[PDB]
Amino acid sequence: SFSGYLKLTDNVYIKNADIVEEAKKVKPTVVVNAANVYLKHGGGVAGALNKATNNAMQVESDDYIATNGPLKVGGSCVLSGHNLAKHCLHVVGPNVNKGEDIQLLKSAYENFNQHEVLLAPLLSAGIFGADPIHSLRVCVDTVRTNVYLAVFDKNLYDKLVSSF
């Protein structure tokens, strides 16, 4: 199962890890993707997850968008987890670099409550522009199901733990 995570709360756990490598090893029921509304998985967590599926995530995602249109900022959809997980929960956090309202980060984390356990990144952090310390605080104060957070950067992981 999940191993080497530091327990932060009753339901939130954290580890310095690449979420792609964690998903390949653990094969969780749900891996969260840090998606954008178009499901265009170019970089960050989305680009890395999609590359690990040999672009199968992007082919599925383009069919989903052709049928349904774009997601909302703060919204999500459940698609296949391909070779990484049973399911991928594509969740759109606000992108601060595009002036999206950071208050939508709590709505984005509420999607996690529909799943008993998830492997996830810190939403809206990284290339989405938000402060990761804030993202972890909104995660702990919003998600009630069991979440295993993979933080790619070691320096940031240590700062997140030491300021918790």
Ligand SMILES: O=S1(=O)CCC[C@@H](CNc2ncnc3[nH]ncc23)C1
């Ligand atoms: O640690 S960071 O520099 C700042 C906090 C948010 C993460 C978001 N990206 C990722 N998080 C987890 N696993 C990943 N694999 N590929 C990308 C990625 C980036």
